[PDB]
Amino acid sequence: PINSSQWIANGNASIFPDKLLLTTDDYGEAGSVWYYKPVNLSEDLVVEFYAYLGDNPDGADGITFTLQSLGTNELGGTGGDLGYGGISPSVAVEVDTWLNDFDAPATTDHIAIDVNGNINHTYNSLTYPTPNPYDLGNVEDGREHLIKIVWNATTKTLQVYFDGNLSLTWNKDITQIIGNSAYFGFTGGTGGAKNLQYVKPIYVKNG
Ligand SMILES: OC[C@H]1O[C@@H](O)[C@@H](O)[C@@H](O)[C@@H]1O
Ligand SMILES: [Ca+2]
Ligand SMILES: [Mn+2]
């Protein structure tokens, strides 16, 4: 179901016939996979994918869905950077499976909106501002989780659904951060803790 010609893998990521592998269950990884054609953010964007965050609750570090207006070679930091930290201009939806000091006020595995490659939730909330991170409890349960991301180019809003539950919303015009055109894709990291991490894209609709 994955057409490998449509995806560009960087770092420790690999394109498989049925999934986008972001990290293997090994230390110090960063992986990214970008879709080959940019989307037009003056139209709506809906992305649905299954995410797998591993089977070890004591593992790390998490994944993102990222919109960024650079290109298909971008790869952010390892570990708590989730393969995303440093990429700008960007907006990311992180699924974060390791509590770093900069993750306050999160208390569990969490989903959050990050901007321009910043993964510090207090900084982003003081600067942009982004919403607080949303605690999911443990998502390193060896199950695939359904994530749906909705950009509405009329209302200038973003919604994020996890396992069918509205988890985050945002009222910032993301085109004023990244421009009207962006690559989309996925990133993952591991550090001093680890997990197998992958996504299975289901549906992408632009307009
Ligand atoms: O992997 C979990 C964590 O491990 C620590 O040793 C560092 O690698 C952090 O960057 C990382 O978030
Ligand atoms: Ca983290
Ligand atoms: Mn986080």
Short mmCIF file of all heavy atoms in Angstrom, two decimals, residues 90-156:
data_model
loop_
_atom_site.label_atom_id
_atom_site.label_comp_id
_atom_site.label_asym_id
_atom_site.label_seq_id
_atom_site.Cartn_x
_atom_site.Cartn_y
_atom_site.Cartn_z
N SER A 90 8.52 25.40 10.49
CA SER A 90 7.75 24.13 10.62
C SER A 90 6.63 24.30 11.65
O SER A 90 6.70 25.19 12.53
CB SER A 90 8.68 23.03 11.06
OG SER A 90 9.18 23.29 12.38
N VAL A 91 5.63 23.44 11.53
CA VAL A 91 4.68 23.15 12.62
C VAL A 91 4.65 21.64 12.73
O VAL A 91 4.52 20.96 11.67
CB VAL A 91 3.30 23.75 12.33
CG1 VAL A 91 2.29 23.26 13.35
CG2 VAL A 91 3.32 25.27 12.29
N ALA A 92 4.76 21.11 13.94
CA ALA A 92 4.76 19.66 14.17
C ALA A 92 3.68 19.34 15.22
O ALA A 92 3.44 20.15 16.14
CB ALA A 92 6.10 19.19 14.64
N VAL A 93 3.13 18.17 15.08
CA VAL A 93 2.33 17.48 16.10
C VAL A 93 3.21 16.34 16.59
O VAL A 93 3.43 15.39 15.84
CB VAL A 93 0.99 16.99 15.54
CG1 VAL A 93 0.23 16.22 16.60
CG2 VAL A 93 0.17 18.16 15.03
N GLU A 94 3.70 16.45 17.82
CA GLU A 94 4.54 15.41 18.42
C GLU A 94 3.67 14.42 19.22
O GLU A 94 2.70 14.80 19.86
CB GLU A 94 5.65 16.07 19.25
CG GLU A 94 5.15 16.78 20.46
CD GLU A 94 6.26 17.13 21.45
OE1 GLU A 94 7.26 17.76 21.03
OE2 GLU A 94 6.11 16.70 22.59
N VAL A 95 4.07 13.15 19.18
CA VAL A 95 3.66 12.11 20.15
C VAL A 95 4.94 11.71 20.91
O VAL A 95 5.80 11.00 20.36
CB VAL A 95 2.94 10.92 19.50
CG1 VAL A 95 2.48 9.92 20.56
CG2 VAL A 95 1.75 11.41 18.69
N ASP A 96 5.02 12.22 22.13
CA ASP A 96 6.26 12.27 22.94
C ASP A 96 6.14 11.23 24.04
O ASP A 96 5.21 11.37 24.85
CB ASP A 96 6.48 13.69 23.47
CG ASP A 96 7.79 13.91 24.20
OD1 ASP A 96 8.41 12.89 24.59
OD2 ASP A 96 8.18 15.08 24.37
N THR A 97 7.07 10.27 24.08
CA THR A 97 7.01 9.08 24.95
C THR A 97 8.12 9.12 26.01
O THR A 97 8.29 8.10 26.67
CB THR A 97 7.11 7.81 24.12
OG1 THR A 97 8.37 7.81 23.44
CG2 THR A 97 5.97 7.73 23.13
N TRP A 98 8.76 10.27 26.24
CA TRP A 98 9.80 10.39 27.29
C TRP A 98 9.78 11.81 27.86
O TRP A 98 9.88 12.81 27.11
CB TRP A 98 11.18 9.99 26.78
CG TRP A 98 12.28 10.19 27.79
CD1 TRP A 98 12.93 11.35 28.09
CD2 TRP A 98 12.85 9.19 28.63
NE1 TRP A 98 13.87 11.14 29.06
CE2 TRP A 98 13.82 9.82 29.43
CE3 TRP A 98 12.62 7.83 28.77
CZ2 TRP A 98 14.60 9.12 30.34
CZ3 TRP A 98 13.37 7.14 29.70
CH2 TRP A 98 14.34 7.77 30.46
N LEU A 99 9.62 11.92 29.17
CA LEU A 99 9.50 13.24 29.80
C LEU A 99 10.89 13.82 30.03
O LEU A 99 11.55 13.40 31.00
CB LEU A 99 8.75 13.09 31.14
CG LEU A 99 7.26 12.87 31.05
CD1 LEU A 99 6.69 12.77 32.45
CD2 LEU A 99 6.56 14.00 30.29
N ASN A 100 11.30 14.75 29.18
CA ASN A 100 12.50 15.60 29.35
C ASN A 100 12.16 16.74 30.32
O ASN A 100 10.97 17.04 30.49
CB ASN A 100 12.97 16.12 27.99
CG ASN A 100 13.29 14.97 27.07
OD1 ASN A 100 12.42 14.53 26.31
ND2 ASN A 100 14.50 14.43 27.18
N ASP A 101 13.16 17.40 30.89
CA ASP A 101 12.88 18.59 31.74
C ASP A 101 12.09 19.65 30.94
O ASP A 101 11.15 20.25 31.50
CB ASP A 101 14.16 19.19 32.33
CG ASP A 101 15.37 19.08 31.41
OD1 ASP A 101 15.26 19.47 30.21
OD2 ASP A 101 16.40 18.56 31.88
N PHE A 102 12.36 19.81 29.63
CA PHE A 102 11.72 20.88 28.84
C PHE A 102 10.28 20.48 28.44
O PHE A 102 9.61 21.26 27.77
CB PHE A 102 12.57 21.19 27.60
CG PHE A 102 12.91 19.96 26.80
CD1 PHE A 102 11.95 19.34 26.01
CD2 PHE A 102 14.21 19.46 26.76
CE1 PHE A 102 12.28 18.24 25.24
CE2 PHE A 102 14.53 18.36 25.97
CZ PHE A 102 13.56 17.75 25.22
N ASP A 103 9.81 19.32 28.89
CA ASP A 103 8.46 18.82 28.52
C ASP A 103 7.39 19.33 29.48
O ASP A 103 6.24 19.21 29.16
CB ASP A 103 8.41 17.30 28.45
CG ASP A 103 8.87 16.74 27.12
OD1 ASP A 103 8.56 17.38 26.12
OD2 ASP A 103 9.56 15.66 27.12
N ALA A 104 7.75 19.99 30.58
CA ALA A 104 6.71 20.53 31.48
C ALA A 104 5.81 21.41 30.61
O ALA A 104 6.30 22.17 29.76
CB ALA A 104 7.34 21.30 32.64
N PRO A 105 4.48 21.50 30.86
CA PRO A 105 3.78 20.80 31.96
C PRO A 105 3.24 19.38 31.68
O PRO A 105 2.37 18.88 32.36
CB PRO A 105 2.62 21.78 32.19
CG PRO A 105 2.28 22.29 30.79
CD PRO A 105 3.64 22.48 30.16
N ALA A 106 3.76 18.69 30.66
CA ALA A 106 3.33 17.28 30.45
C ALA A 106 3.75 16.40 31.64
O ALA A 106 4.79 16.69 32.32
CB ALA A 106 3.90 16.75 29.14
N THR A 107 2.98 15.35 31.91
CA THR A 107 3.26 14.40 33.01
C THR A 107 3.27 12.96 32.52
O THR A 107 3.69 12.09 33.33
CB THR A 107 2.25 14.56 34.16
OG1 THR A 107 0.98 14.06 33.77
CG2 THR A 107 2.13 16.01 34.59
N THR A 108 2.83 12.67 31.30
CA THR A 108 2.84 11.30 30.74
C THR A 108 3.33 11.37 29.29
O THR A 108 3.61 12.49 28.82
CB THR A 108 1.46 10.62 30.82
OG1 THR A 108 0.55 11.16 29.86
CG2 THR A 108 0.79 10.72 32.18
N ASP A 109 3.31 10.26 28.58
CA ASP A 109 3.31 10.32 27.09
C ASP A 109 2.28 11.36 26.68
O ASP A 109 1.19 11.42 27.26
CB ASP A 109 3.03 8.95 26.47
CG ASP A 109 4.04 7.87 26.82
OD1 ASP A 109 5.04 8.18 27.51
OD2 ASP A 109 3.83 6.72 26.37
N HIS A 110 2.62 12.24 25.74
CA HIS A 110 1.77 13.42 25.45
C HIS A 110 1.81 13.75 23.96
O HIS A 110 2.68 13.23 23.18
CB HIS A 110 2.20 14.59 26.33
CG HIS A 110 3.64 14.97 26.16
ND1 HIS A 110 4.66 14.35 26.85
CD2 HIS A 110 4.21 15.94 25.40
CE1 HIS A 110 5.80 15.00 26.57
NE2 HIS A 110 5.54 15.97 25.69
N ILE A 111 0.79 14.49 23.56
CA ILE A 111 0.69 15.03 22.19
C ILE A 111 0.73 16.55 22.36
O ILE A 111 0.10 17.10 23.33
CB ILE A 111 -0.53 14.43 21.45
CG1 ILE A 111 -0.53 14.69 19.95
CG2 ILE A 111 -1.84 14.86 22.08
CD1 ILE A 111 -1.46 13.72 19.20
N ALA A 112 1.46 17.22 21.48
CA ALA A 112 1.66 18.67 21.55
C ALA A 112 1.93 19.22 20.16
O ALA A 112 2.33 18.45 19.25
CB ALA A 112 2.78 19.01 22.48
N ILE A 113 1.64 20.48 20.03
CA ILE A 113 1.99 21.30 18.83
C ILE A 113 3.32 21.96 19.12
O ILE A 113 3.46 22.66 20.16
CB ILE A 113 0.88 22.28 18.43
CG1 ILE A 113 -0.35 21.47 17.98
CG2 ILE A 113 1.36 23.22 17.31
CD1 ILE A 113 -1.65 22.20 18.07
N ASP A 114 4.28 21.79 18.19
CA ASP A 114 5.60 22.48 18.27
C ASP A 114 5.74 23.41 17.06
O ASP A 114 5.06 23.15 16.02
CB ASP A 114 6.76 21.48 18.24
CG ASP A 114 6.76 20.46 19.35
OD1 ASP A 114 6.24 20.78 20.45
OD2 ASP A 114 7.18 19.29 19.11
N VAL A 115 6.53 24.47 17.19
CA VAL A 115 6.73 25.45 16.09
C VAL A 115 8.21 25.68 15.84
O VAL A 115 8.98 25.83 16.80
CB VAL A 115 6.03 26.78 16.37
CG1 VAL A 115 6.29 27.82 15.29
CG2 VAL A 115 4.53 26.55 16.58
N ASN A 116 8.56 25.68 14.56
CA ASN A 116 9.88 26.11 14.04
C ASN A 116 10.99 25.35 14.75
O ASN A 116 12.11 25.92 14.91
CB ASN A 116 10.03 27.62 14.19
CG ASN A 116 9.27 28.36 13.12
OD1 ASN A 116 8.86 27.79 12.09
ND2 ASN A 116 8.99 29.62 13.39
N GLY A 117 10.77 24.07 15.08
CA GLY A 117 11.83 23.17 15.54
C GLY A 117 12.09 23.28 17.03
O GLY A 117 13.07 22.71 17.52
N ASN A 118 11.23 24.00 17.76
CA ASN A 118 11.30 24.15 19.24
C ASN A 118 10.43 23.07 19.89
O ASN A 118 9.27 22.93 19.47
CB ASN A 118 10.93 25.57 19.66
CG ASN A 118 11.83 26.59 19.00
OD1 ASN A 118 11.37 27.50 18.31
ND2 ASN A 118 13.12 26.38 19.12
N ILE A 119 10.99 22.31 20.84
CA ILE A 119 10.31 21.16 21.50
C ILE A 119 10.07 21.45 23.00
O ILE A 119 9.57 20.55 23.67
CB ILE A 119 11.07 19.85 21.20
CG1 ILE A 119 12.57 19.86 21.49
CG2 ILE A 119 10.88 19.49 19.73
CD1 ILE A 119 12.98 20.29 22.84
N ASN A 120 10.44 22.65 23.48
CA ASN A 120 10.21 23.13 24.86
C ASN A 120 8.79 23.68 24.94
O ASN A 120 8.54 24.79 24.37
CB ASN A 120 11.28 24.17 25.25
CG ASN A 120 11.21 24.58 26.70
OD1 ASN A 120 10.12 24.82 27.21
ND2 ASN A 120 12.36 24.70 27.38
N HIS A 121 7.91 23.02 25.70
CA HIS A 121 6.45 23.33 25.70
C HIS A 121 6.17 24.68 26.39
O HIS A 121 5.30 25.47 25.88
CB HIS A 121 5.66 22.14 26.25
CG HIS A 121 5.88 20.91 25.43
ND1 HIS A 121 5.84 20.98 24.08
CD2 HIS A 121 6.16 19.62 25.76
CE1 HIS A 121 6.11 19.78 23.56
NE2 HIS A 121 6.32 18.90 24.58
N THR A 122 6.92 25.02 27.43
CA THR A 122 6.77 26.35 28.09
C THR A 122 7.25 27.49 27.17
O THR A 122 6.55 28.53 27.01
CB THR A 122 7.46 26.32 29.47
OG1 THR A 122 6.77 25.34 30.25
CG2 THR A 122 7.34 27.64 30.19
N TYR A 123 8.40 27.33 26.55
CA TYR A 123 8.92 28.35 25.60
C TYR A 123 7.86 28.58 24.51
O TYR A 123 7.51 29.76 24.27
CB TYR A 123 10.25 27.93 24.98
CG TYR A 123 10.73 28.85 23.88
CD1 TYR A 123 11.57 29.93 24.15
CD2 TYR A 123 10.35 28.64 22.57
CE1 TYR A 123 12.00 30.78 23.14
CE2 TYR A 123 10.77 29.48 21.55
CZ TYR A 123 11.59 30.55 21.83
OH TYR A 123 11.98 31.37 20.81
N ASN A 124 7.38 27.51 23.86
CA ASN A 124 6.41 27.62 22.73
C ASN A 124 5.14 28.33 23.23
O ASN A 124 4.58 29.16 22.46
CB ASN A 124 6.09 26.24 22.09
CG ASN A 124 7.29 25.64 21.38
OD1 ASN A 124 8.32 26.30 21.22
ND2 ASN A 124 7.22 24.37 21.02
N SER A 125 4.63 27.97 24.41
CA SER A 125 3.43 28.58 25.04
C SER A 125 3.70 30.05 25.38
O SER A 125 2.75 30.81 25.31
CB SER A 125 2.96 27.82 26.25
OG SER A 125 2.38 26.54 25.92
N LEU A 126 4.93 30.45 25.70
CA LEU A 126 5.24 31.89 25.99
C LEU A 126 5.45 32.66 24.68
O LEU A 126 5.18 33.87 24.66
CB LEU A 126 6.43 31.98 26.97
CG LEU A 126 6.12 31.51 28.40
CD1 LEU A 126 7.38 31.08 29.13
CD2 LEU A 126 5.38 32.56 29.24
N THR A 127 5.82 32.01 23.57
CA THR A 127 6.34 32.68 22.36
C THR A 127 5.28 32.80 21.26
O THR A 127 5.12 33.91 20.72
CB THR A 127 7.59 31.96 21.84
OG1 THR A 127 8.55 31.97 22.90
CG2 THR A 127 8.20 32.58 20.60
N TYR A 128 4.60 31.69 20.91
CA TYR A 128 3.81 31.59 19.65
C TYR A 128 2.42 32.19 19.79
O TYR A 128 2.07 33.00 18.92
CB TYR A 128 3.93 30.16 19.13
CG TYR A 128 5.36 29.91 18.71
CD1 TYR A 128 6.18 29.02 19.40
CD2 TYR A 128 5.94 30.65 17.68
CE1 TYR A 128 7.51 28.85 19.05
CE2 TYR A 128 7.27 30.48 17.32
CZ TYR A 128 8.06 29.58 18.01
OH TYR A 128 9.37 29.43 17.67
N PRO A 129 1.56 31.86 20.77
CA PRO A 129 1.72 30.75 21.71
C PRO A 129 1.08 29.43 21.22
O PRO A 129 0.10 29.47 20.52
CB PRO A 129 0.88 31.24 22.90
CG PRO A 129 -0.28 31.96 22.25
CD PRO A 129 0.29 32.56 20.98
N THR A 130 1.62 28.30 21.65
CA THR A 130 1.04 26.97 21.37
C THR A 130 0.21 26.56 22.58
O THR A 130 0.43 27.07 23.67
CB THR A 130 2.16 25.96 21.09
OG1 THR A 130 3.08 26.14 22.15
CG2 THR A 130 2.86 26.21 19.77
N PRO A 131 -0.74 25.61 22.42
CA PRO A 131 -1.45 25.02 23.55
C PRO A 131 -0.49 24.25 24.45
O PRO A 131 0.64 23.88 24.05
CB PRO A 131 -2.51 24.06 22.94
CG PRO A 131 -2.41 24.26 21.45
CD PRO A 131 -1.18 25.08 21.14
N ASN A 132 -0.96 23.98 25.66
CA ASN A 132 -0.29 23.04 26.59
C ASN A 132 -0.30 21.67 25.93
O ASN A 132 -1.22 21.30 25.21
CB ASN A 132 -0.98 22.98 27.95
CG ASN A 132 -1.03 24.30 28.69
OD1 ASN A 132 -2.08 24.67 29.21
ND2 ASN A 132 0.10 24.97 28.73
N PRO A 133 0.70 20.85 26.23
CA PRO A 133 0.68 19.46 25.85
C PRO A 133 -0.45 18.71 26.55
O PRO A 133 -0.89 19.04 27.62
CB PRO A 133 2.03 18.89 26.31
CG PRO A 133 2.60 19.90 27.25
CD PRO A 133 1.90 21.22 27.02
N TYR A 134 -0.96 17.72 25.85
CA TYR A 134 -2.09 16.91 26.32
C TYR A 134 -1.59 15.53 26.69
O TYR A 134 -1.07 14.79 25.83
CB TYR A 134 -3.13 16.90 25.22
CG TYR A 134 -4.39 16.24 25.65
CD1 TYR A 134 -5.31 16.94 26.41
CD2 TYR A 134 -4.63 14.91 25.35
CE1 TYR A 134 -6.47 16.34 26.84
CE2 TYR A 134 -5.81 14.30 25.78
CZ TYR A 134 -6.71 15.02 26.52
OH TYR A 134 -7.86 14.46 26.97
N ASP A 135 -1.79 15.15 27.94
CA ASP A 135 -1.36 13.83 28.47
C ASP A 135 -2.25 12.71 27.92
O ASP A 135 -3.50 12.78 28.00
CB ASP A 135 -1.36 13.80 30.00
CG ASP A 135 -0.28 14.64 30.62
OD1 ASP A 135 0.84 14.80 29.95
OD2 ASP A 135 -0.50 15.06 31.80
N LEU A 136 -1.63 11.67 27.40
CA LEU A 136 -2.37 10.52 26.82
C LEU A 136 -2.33 9.29 27.74
O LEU A 136 -2.88 8.24 27.34
CB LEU A 136 -1.73 10.17 25.48
CG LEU A 136 -1.82 11.26 24.40
CD1 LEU A 136 -0.96 10.84 23.22
CD2 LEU A 136 -3.27 11.52 24.01
N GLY A 137 -1.63 9.36 28.87
CA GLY A 137 -1.16 8.18 29.62
C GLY A 137 -0.13 7.43 28.78
O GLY A 137 0.25 7.97 27.72
N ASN A 138 0.15 6.18 29.08
CA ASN A 138 1.09 5.33 28.31
C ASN A 138 0.53 4.98 26.92
O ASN A 138 -0.57 4.46 26.84
CB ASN A 138 1.41 4.05 29.08
CG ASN A 138 2.37 3.17 28.31
OD1 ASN A 138 3.39 3.66 27.86
ND2 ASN A 138 2.01 1.91 28.08
N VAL A 139 1.27 5.29 25.86
CA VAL A 139 0.94 4.89 24.47
C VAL A 139 2.01 3.96 23.93
O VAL A 139 1.88 3.54 22.78
CB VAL A 139 0.71 6.12 23.55
CG1 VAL A 139 -0.36 7.01 24.18
CG2 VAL A 139 1.97 6.91 23.25
N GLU A 140 2.99 3.56 24.78
CA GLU A 140 3.98 2.52 24.42
C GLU A 140 3.43 1.18 24.86
O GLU A 140 4.01 0.57 25.77
CB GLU A 140 5.33 2.84 25.06
CG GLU A 140 5.83 4.21 24.68
CD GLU A 140 6.75 4.81 25.71
OE1 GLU A 140 6.21 5.47 26.65
OE2 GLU A 140 8.01 4.64 25.55
N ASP A 141 2.33 0.78 24.24
CA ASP A 141 1.51 -0.40 24.64
C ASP A 141 1.54 -1.46 23.56
O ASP A 141 0.69 -2.37 23.57
CB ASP A 141 0.08 0.07 24.91
CG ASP A 141 -0.57 0.80 23.73
OD1 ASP A 141 0.04 0.90 22.65
OD2 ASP A 141 -1.70 1.25 23.90
N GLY A 142 2.43 -1.34 22.60
CA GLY A 142 2.53 -2.28 21.48
C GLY A 142 1.29 -2.31 20.63
O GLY A 142 1.13 -3.28 19.93
N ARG A 143 0.46 -1.26 20.63
CA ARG A 143 -0.71 -1.15 19.71
C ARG A 143 -0.49 0.01 18.72
O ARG A 143 0.26 0.93 19.02
CB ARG A 143 -2.01 -0.88 20.49
CG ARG A 143 -2.34 -1.86 21.61
CD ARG A 143 -3.71 -1.44 22.15
NE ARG A 143 -4.05 -1.87 23.51
CZ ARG A 143 -4.65 -3.02 23.84
NH1 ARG A 143 -4.98 -3.91 22.91
NH2 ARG A 143 -4.92 -3.29 25.10
N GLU A 144 -1.14 -0.04 17.56
CA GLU A 144 -1.20 1.11 16.61
C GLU A 144 -2.29 2.06 17.06
O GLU A 144 -3.39 1.60 17.50
CB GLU A 144 -1.40 0.59 15.19
CG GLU A 144 -0.18 -0.17 14.68
CD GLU A 144 -0.35 -0.81 13.31
OE1 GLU A 144 -1.46 -0.76 12.79
OE2 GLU A 144 0.62 -1.33 12.76
N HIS A 145 -2.01 3.36 17.06
CA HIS A 145 -2.97 4.40 17.49
C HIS A 145 -3.36 5.25 16.30
O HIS A 145 -2.50 5.56 15.50
CB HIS A 145 -2.33 5.21 18.61
CG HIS A 145 -2.16 4.41 19.85
ND1 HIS A 145 -1.01 3.67 20.13
CD2 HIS A 145 -3.03 4.12 20.84
CE1 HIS A 145 -1.18 3.04 21.28
NE2 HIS A 145 -2.40 3.30 21.73
N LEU A 146 -4.64 5.59 16.19
CA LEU A 146 -5.14 6.36 15.05
C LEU A 146 -5.00 7.85 15.36
O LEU A 146 -5.52 8.27 16.38
CB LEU A 146 -6.60 5.98 14.82
CG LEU A 146 -7.24 6.74 13.67
CD1 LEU A 146 -6.49 6.42 12.38
CD2 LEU A 146 -8.73 6.38 13.58
N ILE A 147 -4.27 8.58 14.53
CA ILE A 147 -4.09 10.05 14.68
C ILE A 147 -4.71 10.72 13.47
O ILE A 147 -4.48 10.27 12.34
CB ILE A 147 -2.61 10.44 14.83
CG1 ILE A 147 -2.04 9.67 16.01
CG2 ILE A 147 -2.48 11.96 14.97
CD1 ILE A 147 -0.60 10.00 16.32
N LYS A 148 -5.51 11.75 13.72
CA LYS A 148 -6.11 12.54 12.63
C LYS A 148 -5.79 14.00 12.87
O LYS A 148 -5.96 14.49 14.00
CB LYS A 148 -7.62 12.35 12.52
CG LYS A 148 -8.19 13.16 11.36
CD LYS A 148 -9.65 12.93 11.09
CE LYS A 148 -10.50 13.35 12.25
NZ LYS A 148 -11.93 13.38 11.85
N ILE A 149 -5.24 14.64 11.85
CA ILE A 149 -4.85 16.06 11.95
C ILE A 149 -5.66 16.84 10.91
O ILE A 149 -5.70 16.40 9.75
CB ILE A 149 -3.35 16.19 11.77
CG1 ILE A 149 -2.65 15.44 12.92
CG2 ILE A 149 -2.95 17.64 11.69
CD1 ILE A 149 -1.20 15.25 12.69
N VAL A 150 -6.33 17.89 11.36
CA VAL A 150 -7.24 18.68 10.50
C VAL A 150 -6.76 20.13 10.47
O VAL A 150 -6.84 20.81 11.48
CB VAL A 150 -8.70 18.57 10.95
CG1 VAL A 150 -9.59 19.35 9.98
CG2 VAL A 150 -9.13 17.12 11.02
N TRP A 151 -6.33 20.60 9.32
CA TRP A 151 -6.06 22.02 9.06
C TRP A 151 -7.22 22.57 8.24
O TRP A 151 -7.51 22.03 7.14
CB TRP A 151 -4.71 22.19 8.31
CG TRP A 151 -4.58 23.51 7.63
CD1 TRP A 151 -4.50 23.72 6.28
CD2 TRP A 151 -4.49 24.82 8.25
NE1 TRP A 151 -4.38 25.06 6.03
CE2 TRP A 151 -4.38 25.75 7.20
CE3 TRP A 151 -4.54 25.28 9.57
CZ2 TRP A 151 -4.30 27.11 7.45
CZ3 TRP A 151 -4.43 26.63 9.82
CH2 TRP A 151 -4.33 27.53 8.76
N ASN A 152 -7.87 23.62 8.76
CA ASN A 152 -9.00 24.28 8.07
C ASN A 152 -8.47 25.63 7.63
O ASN A 152 -8.15 26.43 8.52
CB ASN A 152 -10.24 24.33 8.97
CG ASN A 152 -11.45 24.82 8.22
OD1 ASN A 152 -11.37 25.81 7.49
ND2 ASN A 152 -12.56 24.12 8.36
N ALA A 153 -8.32 25.83 6.31
CA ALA A 153 -7.71 27.03 5.71
C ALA A 153 -8.76 28.15 5.69
O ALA A 153 -8.37 29.29 5.52
CB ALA A 153 -7.17 26.77 4.32
N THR A 154 -10.02 27.85 5.95
CA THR A 154 -11.08 28.91 6.10
C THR A 154 -11.07 29.48 7.52
O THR A 154 -10.95 30.70 7.68
CB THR A 154 -12.44 28.38 5.66
OG1 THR A 154 -12.34 28.03 4.28
CG2 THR A 154 -13.55 29.40 5.86
N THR A 155 -11.14 28.65 8.55
CA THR A 155 -11.18 29.11 9.96
C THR A 155 -9.78 29.39 10.50
O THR A 155 -9.68 29.97 11.59
CB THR A 155 -11.96 28.07 10.78
OG1 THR A 155 -11.27 26.84 10.62
CG2 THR A 155 -13.39 27.95 10.30
N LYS A 156 -8.73 28.94 9.82
CA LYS A 156 -7.32 29.01 10.30
C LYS A 156 -7.19 28.27 11.62
O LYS A 156 -6.70 28.86 12.61
CB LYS A 156 -6.80 30.44 10.42
CG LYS A 156 -7.13 31.34 9.23
CD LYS A 156 -6.52 30.91 7.93
CE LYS A 156 -6.92 31.85 6.81
NZ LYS A 156 -6.59 31.27 5.49
#
